[PDB]
Amino acid sequence: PADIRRATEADMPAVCTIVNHYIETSTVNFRTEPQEPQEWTDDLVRLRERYPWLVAEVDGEVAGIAYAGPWKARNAYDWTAESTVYVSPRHQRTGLGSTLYTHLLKSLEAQGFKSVVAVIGLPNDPSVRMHEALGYAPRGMLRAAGFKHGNWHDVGFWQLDFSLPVPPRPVLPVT
Amino acid sequence: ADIRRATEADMPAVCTIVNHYIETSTVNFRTEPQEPQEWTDDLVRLRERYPWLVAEVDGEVAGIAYAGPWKARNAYDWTAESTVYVSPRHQRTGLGSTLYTHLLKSLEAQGFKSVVAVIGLPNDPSVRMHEALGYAPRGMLRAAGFKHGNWHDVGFWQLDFSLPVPPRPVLPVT
Numbered sequence: 001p002a003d004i005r006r007a008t009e010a011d012m013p014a015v016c017t018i019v020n021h022y023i024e025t026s027t028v029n030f031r032t033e034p035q036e037p038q039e040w041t042d043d044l045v046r047l048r049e050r051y052p053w054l055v056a057e058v059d060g061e062v063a064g065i066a067y068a069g070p071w072k073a074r075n076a077y078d079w080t081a082e083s084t085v086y087v088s089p090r091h092q093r094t095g096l097g098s099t100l101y102t103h104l105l106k107s108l109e110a111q112g113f114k115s116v117v118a119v120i121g122l123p124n125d126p127s128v129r130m131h132e133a134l135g136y137a138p139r140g141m142l143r144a145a146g147f148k149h150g151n152w153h154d155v156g157f158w159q160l161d162f163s164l165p166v167p168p169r170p171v172l173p174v175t
Numbered sequence: 176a177d178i179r180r181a182t183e184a185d186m187p188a189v190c191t192i193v194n195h196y197i198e199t200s201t202v203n204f205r206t207e208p209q210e211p212q213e214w215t216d217d218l219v220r221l222r223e224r225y226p227w228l229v230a231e232v233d234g235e236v237a238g239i240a241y242a243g244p245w246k247a248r249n250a251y252d253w254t255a256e257s258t259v260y261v262s263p264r265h266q267r268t269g270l271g272s273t274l275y276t277h278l279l280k281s282l283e284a285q286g287f288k289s290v291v292a293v294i295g296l297p298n299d300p301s302v303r304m305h306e307a308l309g310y311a312p313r314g315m316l317r318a319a320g321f322k323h324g325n326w327h328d329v330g331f332w333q334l335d336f337s338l339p340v341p342p343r344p345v346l347p348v349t
């Protein structure tokens with residue numbers, strides 16, 4: 001049982017703690033330096049009206065986050081979003097990641113986006129199989145795109161497509 | 176004249192060249208023409224870590240080739256993104272591939288691991304220039320952009336180098 005809701009500035013210290021754990025312990029994230037809560041708050045405020053940012057509360061505690069942002073800052077990409085999801089390392093494999101992402105994707109689809117792209121640092125079987133279970137299709141892979149944790153790691157692109165006409169209408173904000 | 180390092184005085188000419196493709200083609204996914212200072216801010220920020228080159232003909236800028244970061248996360252630091260534009264008239268005089276060759280030999284010498292090109296499709300000329308220089312097709316996003324009345328895919332081409340492990344810091348252009 002998890003309350004899926006919109007992320008607030010008060011959730012960011014907890015979100016920052018979760019993601020920092022994977023930055024240090026895993027190559028799932030290509031950052032090599034932990035983040036501070038305010039950097040997270042800055043991205044949220046800048047993106048939450050235009051892209052969905054969701055947290056999952058469990059027993060009053062933040063147990064995961066799923067958020068979206070722009071793929072690239074050029075206008076033709078405006079209908080292309082990038083998605084991300086992180087679950088606390090003690091609440092994994094309980095369905096929170098899929099529940100968060102399902103809510104994220106329905107918002108993105110209702111808003112009028114064309115597609116959603118996921119950038120997965122490989123290897124990462126849990127994230128690959130979750131994304132492919134929710135309809136993401138493999139699209140590409142850059143070889144040795146990053147050096148983290150003493151090795152070169154490929155990065156893969158997964159994409160989930162929605163149906164839009166020609167021309168597409170400007171996408172709706174979250175509200 | 177000829178091929179040299181880009182200066183702040185070259186940016187207006189560079190901006191005029193690229194704006195031509197912003198306004199008339201889908202090889203780049205901007206819909207809003209640019210202003211020379213956005214180029215100047217990038218040049219000054221990057222010219223010491225990444226090569227920024229211009230080609231001259233008759234003392235006039237005829238094309239630019241530059242590299243920059245692929246993604247702003249430190250693991251990507253040995254991965255560069257490459258770009259090249261030639262003025263409409265100077266196309267098919269060996270300028271592009273010659274510009275790109277000098278750009279690539281600098282990136283390999285500085286100690287980068289690979290070079291990535293993001294090509295908005297259709298773009299048969301660019302696909303061919305890149306694969307002729309050793310780039311391999313590595314992926315493609317479907318209908319990633321809408322411009323000029325249609326959806327357009329975008330493809331990724333990659334040129335791989337070889338580095339020792341752990342890799343040393345990339346050397347500056349100087």
Ligand SMILES: CC(C)(COP(=O)(O)OP(=O)(O)OC[C@H]1O[C@@H](n2cnc3c(N)ncnc32)[C@H](O)[C@@H]1OP(=O)(O)O)[C@@H](O)C(=O)NCCC(=O)NCCS
Nearest residue numbers: 028085086087092093094095096097098120126127129130
């Ligand atoms: C990837 C992640 C978000 C998955 O969320 P989750 O809540 O743990 O997984 P779920 O309970 O929602 O399960 C959904 C599907 O994900 C897959 N999956 C999740 N964990 C898996 C694991 N260890 N091994 C194999 N498949 C796994 C399964 O296909 C699962 O389907 P199933 O439960 O019906 O068998 C979670 O593992 C995580 O936070 N990893 C660290 C951060 C990360 O990698 N984020 C992805 C960035 S690309």
Ligand SMILES: CC(C)(COP(=O)(O)OP(=O)(O)OC[C@H]1O[C@@H](n2cnc3c(N)ncnc32)[C@H](O)[C@@H]1OP(=O)(O)O)[C@@H](O)C(=O)NCCC(=O)NCCS
Nearest residue numbers: 202259260261266267268269270271272294300301303304
């Ligand atoms: C793409 C571009 C840099 C090619 O460089 P160029 O100076 O025009 O062409 P070059 O003579 O230097 O040679 C480059 C190679 O690419 C191919 N090529 C170049 N122009 C081509 C054209 N109109 N049609 C088909 N192939 C072409 C050719 O294989 C050519 O080799 P070739 O001389 O043996 O035919 C240039 O045409 C350009 O600026 N195009 C528009 C902007 C652009 O597409 N940038 C790509 C960013 S991803």
Ligand SMILES: CCCCCCCCCO[C@@H]1O[C@H](CO)[C@@H](O)[C@H](O)[C@H]1O
Nearest residue numbers: 224248249250252253343344345346347
């Ligand atoms: C390519 C310049 C990288 C700048 C962006 C990353 C900032 C934090 C780490 O920087 C390091 O600085 C070196 C330059 O001396 C690089 O060679 C090295 O790979 C990179 O890990």
Ligand SMILES: CP(=O)(O)CC[C@H](N)C(=O)O
Nearest residue numbers: 028029030084119120121
């Ligand atoms: C490999 P990367 O660090 O570029 C992105 C990882 C993850 N999808 C996220 O969005 O954090």
Ligand SMILES: CP(=O)(O)CC[C@H](N)C(=O)O
Nearest residue numbers: 202203204258293294295
């Ligand atoms: C299709 P896009 O606009 O993302 C990049 C086009 C060209 N590689 C460039 O860097 O100008």
